[PDB]
Design goal:
about 25% strand, Rossmann fold, alpha+beta, dimeric, malaria, about 475 residues, ligase, homodimer, binds ligand JE6, binds proline, PRS
Chain lengths: ~475, ~475
């Protein structure tokens, strides 16, 4: 009975995951499949990254707005997601006069009105962002945080007078996403360009951040930044009069990150005692647990712990003193380890008379004795050191998951050691499907598809030797590409 | 042509309103009726009040969460909004296996899972809040901000071990709503209790803040705080084991405020030059406009204005220097008056050599000469004074809209001078419909209904004389009640 996780992360990944997100109180399941309740501990992470991203995109002059949840068939025909689109058809027990659709993304909704806001070069750039939810009602297997039917995200859309400005903003955003994942979630990502078979519909190109879950060998797209060029401008007639009084199409970007980031964080840092949180996204940085070794007095210990609590709160470090008289210290240790609190301070009589206390890190369980008036400083530093540790332990694990190959015969082996492969590729779009269908075929060897897809063409390219040929088709290769199984 | 408003507020209210919200760039209309785009200037107000409310409800230990947008028929039967509920019935061109509903409110969605979170008195109180959007797909006439089919709001839900705690939280929330409207929107409200015909379905009682628009004589409900008692607990089986090991029902509250607050603010402070913003919800507190009286040099004036801009930004007062070479100073004055900026600073050559500048308040258009090194301080104070002025001018207008009456014969007259009436009332629910139907009948005398409804029973009650009888039914009266036309 007790608590904790009954599956080990390295042995039954999927069940370890569902156990962790339910018992850490991040998530509640719901009676519609693919929909989940975000309880306060998870919503707090989202609020944290929201504050960071809002502050960074105000420096780029992006402004927040809110657009409607619904779109008409009329405006949806200008883009001619068709099966992922949910249709509202009645109110109460009577039918609507015209059925309407719930947004899977806000391109058509927003660009239906862009033309009245953009008429001349004086109106550019236009830079909008929304924090909202979208609905993609697919019938594949959902995964909490990772792939859901309704999810929270941010979506930004910009319009510029030329291509250079737009592309610069695309890559500025992509580095903001790098920081979102590193400075707050302590998660390393790889920047790259999607192949033509995988880019956003209507984009000129799609840039992307990719993460990897090494325990089950799967890549996950972490965020995207599309250069749309003038494609949507042509569809929606977003013209402006330039400084030579010539009509031009705007050059557009759109970009998005979702609550999938939370999932990625859990899958990277979680362990067999459960959740591990980077301090910057944990509401409580410290939990103080008292220990009464049948002590002659509770109240010296109560007094001491609340002294430590006010030391910590005066310096704006939010913490909690678990003084519940009903539970034992061991119960409390596990209760807060499962909920991911980064630092635990224990005081017993032994520590009280040495004017000391025990500090325990949640990441490596290393315990340290520290004098009372030293605790604040040693807490601050150690919070910092926890982040770096999490990050670098994840960074190493990312680096050691990429096997460089030059022929298809090396590929299946690497996939079955739970790796991605970096391979020379001709980038012809037909080969994408072929590679998918062959890797799946040779996967006869755990609920998700064995196909390997192109994940991204890394921005950091290794040199392409002179006559190096494509690992799949034998044609002359153009670039190095990442392939792997994904979510 | 030019710009501005072609209708005066006191003569064609509804058209003045639509002109103001479109031309101040608060709102864009959409091709689905009753749905509106919140452009950045309006969304900024919402973000402001969001920050205030988040900080205040964290002091009450309310925690933010996110629940799904959809509910099943199954969970919707436990509450047996039926016509306001939109039904999703297909994805793409295929039908869903079971149709699902979009939330008009989250009671049934959240309380379907409350029972697994509340099992014992140790689990109470439970305090949740959501920032989200809801859909009420009615076929009455929509009004931007005021009554829409999709709107943004906050909804809080709490569960307590007894009635006293729950009721205390109800009225704590109601005073937070009072502060939201006063300290940020500079809008006075009246606190009261809804009559039994107007309270939330399933509530024990509904407390409410009401506002009044004196230019067209209409009350608007500004926010609500419901004491649900154990009604929803009985429906959803939210039981807990108390400290005497007896099974008890939780006592619940729910409470909400929407973007209707923005509308109320516009209707209170707007004038014939357009929008008037309280500084605390304006992104730009100050706009600096340069004036070149055919000056021998632009650049002394450019230098001076940017000096003033850095004085203002160093002290964290966000402002904008309108240096567009194309437009005249008069154009710029109207451009920023229409957009509601509270303070305008003008510099011409005359002012530059006196080392002075002109400060103009947006509320009363009063202009004042001020020395350069004095500007910061005189800006700060004047921002403050603008708020109080707006508030008290609105407060007076609220007070002078209530006529106290004792018989029905006085009522129609007061309604036609655009007043509310405070009347002695027996509070029998039947009379509600009767009073509605009679006032509408006698309204033959501008697109909205002439019926007068009970708005609220004020918390601030005048004394009820000994044998005072109900103004409608002649029965002995119980309390004083506000009645009027509403939105
Ligand atoms: C939670 C989450 C996230 C995301 N996506 C999309 C790509 C992206 C990135 N990068 C967004 C564009 C920015 C991302 O995170 C997508 C999703 N659901 C789905 O696709 C639908 C679905 C539902 C159930 C099963 C299978 C599929 N669910
Ligand atoms: C913008 C906004 C606000 C609010 N409501 C509700 C009461 C409340 C208060 N207090 C909320 C509970 C807190 C409020 O603000 C309600 C609405 N639409 C509607 O009723 C539906 C509708 C749509 C078109 C025409 C006529 C009616 N639209
Ligand atoms: O869904 C996507 O991938 C793009 C980026 C956000 C809006 N549309
Ligand atoms: O809609 C209402 O009036 C209540 C308060 C927020 C949730 N339900």
């Amino acid at each position: 009975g007790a608590m904790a996780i009954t599956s080990k992360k390295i042995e039954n990944f999927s069940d370890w995951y569902t156990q962790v997100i339910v018992k850490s109180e991040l998530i509640e399941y719901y009676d519609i499949s693919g929909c989940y309740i975000l309880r306060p501990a998870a919503y707090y992470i989202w609020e944290c990254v929201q504050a960071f991203f809002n502050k960074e995109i105000k420096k780029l002059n992006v402004e927040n707005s809110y657009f409607p949840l619904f779109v008409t068939k009329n405006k949806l025909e200008k883009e001619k997601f068709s099966p992922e689109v949910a249709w509202v058809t009645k109110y109460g027990d009577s039918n609507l006069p015209e059925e309407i659709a719930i947004r899977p993304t806000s391109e058509t909704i927003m660009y239906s009105v862009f033309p009245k806001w953009i008429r001349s070069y004086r109106d550019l750039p236009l830079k909008l962002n929304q924090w909202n939810t979208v609905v993609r009602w697919e019938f594949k297997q959902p995964t909490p945080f990772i792939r859901t039917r309704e999810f929270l995200w941010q979506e930004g859309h910009t319009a510029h007078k030329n291509e250079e400005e737009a592309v610069k903003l695309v890559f500025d955003i992509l580095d903001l996403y790098r920081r979102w994942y590193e400075e707050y979630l302590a998660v390393p990502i790889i920047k790259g360009i999607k192949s033509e078979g995988e880019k956003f519909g209507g984009a000129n190109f799609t840039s992307t951040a990719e993460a990897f879950i090494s325990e089950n060998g799967r890549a996950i797209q972490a965020a995207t930044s599309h250069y749309l060029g003038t494609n949507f401008a042509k569809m929606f007639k977003i013209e402006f009069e330039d400084e030579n009084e010539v009509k031009q199409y705007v050059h557009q970007t759109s970009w998005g990150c979702t609550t999938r980031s939370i999932g990625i964080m859990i899958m990277t840092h979680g362990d067999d005692k459960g959740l591990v949180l980077p301090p910057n996204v944990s509401k409580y940085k410290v939990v103080i647990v008292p220990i009464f070794y049948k002590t002659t007095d509770e109240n010296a210990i109560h007094s001491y712990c609340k002294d430590i609590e006010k030391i910590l709160k005066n310096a704006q470090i939010n913490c909690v003193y678990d003084d519940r008289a009903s539970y034992s210290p061991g119960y409390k240790f596990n209760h807060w380890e499962l909920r991911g609190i980064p630092i635990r301070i224990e005081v017993g009589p032994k520590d009280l008379q040495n004017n000391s206390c025990v500090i325990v890190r949640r990441d490596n369980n290393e315990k340290c004795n520290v004098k009372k008036e030293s605790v604040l400083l040693e807490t601050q530093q150690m919070l910092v050191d926890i982040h770096k540790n999490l990050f670098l332990k994840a960074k190493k694990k990312l680096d050691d998951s990429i096997v460089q190959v030059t022929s298809f015969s090396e590929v299946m082996n690497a996939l079955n050691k739970k790796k991605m492969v970096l391979a020379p590729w001709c980038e012809d779009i037909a080969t994408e499907e072929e590679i998918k269908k062959e890797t799946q075929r040779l996967s006869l060897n755990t609920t998700l598809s064995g196909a390997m897809k192109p994940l991204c063409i890394p921005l950091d390219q290794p040199p392409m030797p002179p006559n190096m040929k494509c690992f799949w088709s034998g044609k002359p290769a153009k670039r190095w590409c990442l392939f792997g199984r994904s979510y």
